[PDB]
Design a protein around this ligand. Structure first.
Ligand SMILES: O=C(CN1C(=O)CSc2ccc(Cl)cc21)NC1(C(=O)O)CCCCC1
Ligand SMILES: [Zn+2]
Length: 854
């Protein structure tokens, strides 16, 4: 019998309203069984129900009407479309309720998606097995058969059968636990509100918990393994504050009685926003006040803010289809900064936002970047939407739109959009309609330019007395027109002046002549700026003579833009390097980090070429440039989060480049720490430098690795992994890859990061690209084609190559995969990146060699 449906998308005429899911997982055999009952209605007469199912063995399917009548359903499967077809003996009557009942079995996934196995070892040595879920985007169909597309919203009543030794949690509160046959307990959770299948969640584990109630009465809890629940308090307090913030900000209460935050021992992404049961990597939630870094504290706060923003932007209101995933992700990413700027003002997170926009511009400058909203169909293409364009470009265009409309008008537009579309699905046009309903400024033409075209513009400024000429063109490495909300300040006015450039060119007249003008104030706009004539000389002079004339983020924007303009031949590498010399007097984290972001990649290219002399001189130039700031750092955990992050990065950079004052200090801490058998608490902020130096000897590497198995600190485990990956012993590098790939000694959730760190090691970088090619199939099976993890592995191991032989290795390898990876967007991105690295190094290597000598 041929399969009666030939489309990836399900039919539109059979709609679910409610699911009753009974799941029994047997954690000793890793088998699970389920009974799914789905209440549906048909709007057309049909005798066939198509729905999703992947890797489930269906034993029986029946159609109930009512007066109960049952009819057996015949089951057909189309595994490539991940669909099943259920055939009824007579047509369903239009508009009447029916209930499809499906009994099935499956095996817990050994990946990080679907209903999957997670393990950990107690401090006492016992291996413990738990089961958890990760469904977004298309894996709910691996746990229960369903209409697995986000616009088929429905309510869900979940029942879990489990051994008495385990705890089960799910989206909603536990309302009853009933003893059933064969020594099991069946937990019944309350019915969810109407929501997408990808948000269903359930966990069977040994977790402990802590809780706190919001002012609105919502019970917030953190769940973690017993040995780590003592690290839950920071996240619990942050979650209560952030949930209260969003309820007030949006004027829409959180609608469930409780919100859980569960730290899972094995987790692929950072976290997931399942309604009522948000999940996290342990590193993204758990804070050890003695060993966690300042960056970790900031990251937990932002991750909790992101998952809680999604309760409104993603859960309450959901994109209709994955082409518009940015409506969920760009908003959640932007709301991290809107919220944490108010809830945790000590973190000064608004100061860091622009860096996310420069992350998006790296990808979006390439010829094959995709528009923010773009068509996708199959699961791998949908997973590719979880990328820096949806998250970071999405947040950056919303920031630009909020600055343009004003925070109050943008907030009113948010609130109207969330209220109007509550418990429903949206597309881009709904957001523009809401934003314009405030009848306010129409946003559709402008925002279509930022969502339906790839890339961003270069704005060129030419000043002739009071006349300021503006032009826009597409910025691309290797037709476009936007509505660009420009901003500028000048030597005579630090008010933010606004000008909307909707055309190829325009002109404005300053009230009086100025000494300099600086566009894109605060880097709040998604564009870059070039200045003709003496413009770059004037801004270089401003940075050299009176750098505080513009904000720290404005100085970071000039550093980034100057180097981006070298790439397209608008500014010479010598002039961009001359501008970077001002950094000898820079004190602030954002412009220092932007200088590292532009200069460090240049030596990473040199490390993989026959360029020892220039590589050495370039690294010496970088340390000389920042030497005074490096020397001023204390070897402590003092200061604000920015002061701490700046210290840690600078000491690590200095030690990696063998700056003897820092190496000697790091060697002394490592020796004292090792001689004390690790008793001695080191300042967290110097730990990366200390461990990186210590792991350079065989005794130090072995000692550091010996402490890894006992650590309960996600920061300490991360710092040890980083340091071990800096070894120049290739047998130890291969061991790190083999062992993290296997997941026993080092968990596989760390393998993507370890592979990129080894891909960036100056001696062992070939091993990482080699490992990726040899183990590709298993890596795809574990992490999935199209995943952000596979994208980071492909870029991480290849995007610092700069020869035509390496470019052909990448093209030849990936083209040979055919359906198993040749068409990945990350592969085209890394090819275009290597093509740019080849051209940039051919054009600029000798110029840099001469500049360093002069
Ligand atoms: O270079 C890298 C990693 N890395 C890149 O690979 C190119 S993108 C990048 C941007 C900024 C910074 Cl701080 C590092 C970057 N890390 C160090 C190194 O030399 O490998 C140098 C810093 C100390 C830690 C080591
Ligand atoms: Zn998100």
């Amino acid at each position: 019998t041929p399969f009666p449906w030939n489309k990836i998308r399900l039919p539109e005429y059979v709609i679910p309203v409610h699911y009753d899911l009974l799941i029994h997982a047997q954690l000793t055999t890793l088998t699970f069984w389920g009974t799914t009952k789905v209440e549906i209605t048909a709007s057309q007469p049909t005798s066939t129900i198509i729905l999703h199912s992947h890797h489930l063995q269906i034993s029986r399917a029946t159609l109930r009407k009512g007066r109960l009548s049952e009819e057996p359903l015949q089951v057909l499967e189309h595994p490539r479309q991940e669909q099943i077809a259920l055939l009824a003996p007579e047509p369903l009557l239009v508009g009447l309720p029916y209930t499809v009942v499906i009994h099935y079995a499956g095996q817990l996934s050994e990946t990080f998606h679907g209903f999957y196995k997670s393990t950990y070892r107690t401090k006492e040595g016992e291996l413990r097995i738990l089961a958890s879920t990760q469904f977004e985007p298309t894996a709910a169909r691996m746990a229960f058969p369903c209409f697995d597309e986000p616009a088929f919203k429905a309510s869900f009543s979940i029942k879990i059968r489990r051994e008495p030794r385990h705890l089960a949690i799910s989206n909603m509160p536990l309302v009853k636990s009933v003893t059933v046959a064969e020594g099991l307990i069946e937990d019944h959770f309350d019915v969810t509100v109407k929501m997408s299948t990808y948000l269903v969640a359930f966990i069977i584990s040994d977790f402990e918990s802590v809780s706190k109630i919001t002012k609105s009465g919502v019970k917030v809890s953190v769940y973690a393994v017993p040995d780590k629940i003592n690290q839950a308090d920071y996240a619990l307090d942050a979650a209560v504050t952030l949930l209260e913030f969003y309820e007030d900000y949006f004027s829409i209460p959180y609608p469930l009685p409780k919100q859980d935050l569960a730290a899972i021992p094995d987790f692929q992404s950072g976290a997931m926003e399942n309604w009522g049961l948000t999940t996290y990597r342990e590193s993204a939630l758990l804070f050890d006040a003695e060993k966690s870094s300042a960056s970790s504290k900031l990251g937990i706060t932002m991750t909790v803010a992101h998952e809680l923003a999604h309760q409104w932007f993603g859960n309450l209101v959901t994109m209709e289809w994955w082409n518009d995933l940015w409506l969920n992700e760009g908003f959640a990413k932007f709301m991290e900064f809107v919220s944490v700027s108010v809830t945790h003002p000590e973190l000064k997170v608004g100061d860091y936002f622009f860096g996310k926009c420069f992350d998006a511009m790296e990808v979006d400058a390439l010829q094959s970047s995709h528009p923010v909203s773009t068509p996708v169909e199959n699961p791998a293409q949908i997973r590719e939407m979880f990328d820096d364009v949806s998250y970071d470009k999405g947040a950056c265009i919303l920031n630009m739109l909020r600055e343009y409309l004003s925070a109050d008008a943008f907030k009113s537009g948010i609130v109207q959009y969330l209220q109007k579309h509550s418990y429903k699905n949206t597309k881009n046009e709904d957001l523009w309609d809401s934003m314009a309903s405030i009848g306010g400024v129409d946003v559709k033409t402008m925002m279509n330019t930022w969502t339906l075209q790839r890339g961003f513009p270069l704005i060129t400024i030419t000043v002739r007395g009071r006349n300021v000429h503006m032009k826009q063109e597409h910025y691309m490495k290797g037709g476009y027109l936007w509505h660009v909300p420009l901003t500028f300040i000048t030597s005579k006015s630090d008010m933010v002046h606004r000008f909307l450039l909707k055309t190829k060119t325009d002109v404005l007249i300053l009230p009086e002549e100025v000494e300099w003008i600086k566009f894109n104030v605060g880097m709040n706009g998604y564009y870059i700026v070039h200045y003709e004539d003496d413009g770059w000389d004037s801004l270089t002079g401003l940075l050299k003579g009176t750098h505080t004339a513009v904000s720290s983020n404005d100085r970071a924007s000039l550093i980034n833009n100057a180097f981006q303009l070298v790439s397209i031949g608008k500014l010479s590498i010598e002039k961009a390097l001359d501008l970077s010399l001002y950094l000898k007097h820079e004190t602030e984290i954002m412009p220092v980090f932007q200088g590292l972001n532009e200069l460090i990649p240049m030596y990473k290219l040199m490390e993989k070429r026959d360029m020892n002399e220039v590589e050495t001189q370039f690294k010496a130039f970088l340390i000389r440039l920042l030497r005074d700031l490096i020397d001023k750092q204390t070897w402590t955990d003092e200061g604000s989060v920015s002061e701490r992050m700046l210290r840690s990065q600078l000491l690590l950079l200095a030690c990696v480049h063998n700056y003897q004052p820092c190496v000697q200090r790091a060697e002394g801490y490592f020796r004292k720490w090792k001689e004390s058998n690790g008793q001695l608490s080191l300042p967290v902020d110097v730990t990366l430098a200390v461990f990186a130096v210590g792991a350079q000897s065989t005794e130090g590497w072995d000692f550091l690795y010996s402490k890894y198995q006992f650590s309960l600190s996600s920061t300490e485990k991360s710092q040890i992994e980083f340091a071990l990956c800096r070894t120049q012993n290739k047998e130890k590098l291969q061991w790190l890859l083999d062992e993290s790939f296997k997941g026993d000694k080092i968990k596989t959730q760390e393998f993507p990061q370890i592979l990129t760190l080894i891909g960036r090691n100056p001696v062992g970088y070939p091993l990482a690209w080699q490992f990726l090619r040899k183990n590709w199939n298993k890596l795809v099976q574990k992490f999935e084609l199209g995943s952000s993890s596979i994208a980071h592995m492909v870029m991480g191991t290849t995007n610092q190559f700069s020869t035509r032989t390496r470019l052909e290795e990448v093209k030849g390898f990936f083209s040979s995969l055919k359906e198993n990876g040749s068409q990945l967007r990350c592969v085209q991105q890394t090819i275009e990146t290597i093509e740019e690295n080849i051209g940039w190094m051919d054009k600029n290597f000798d110029k840099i060699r001469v500049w360093l000598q002069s």
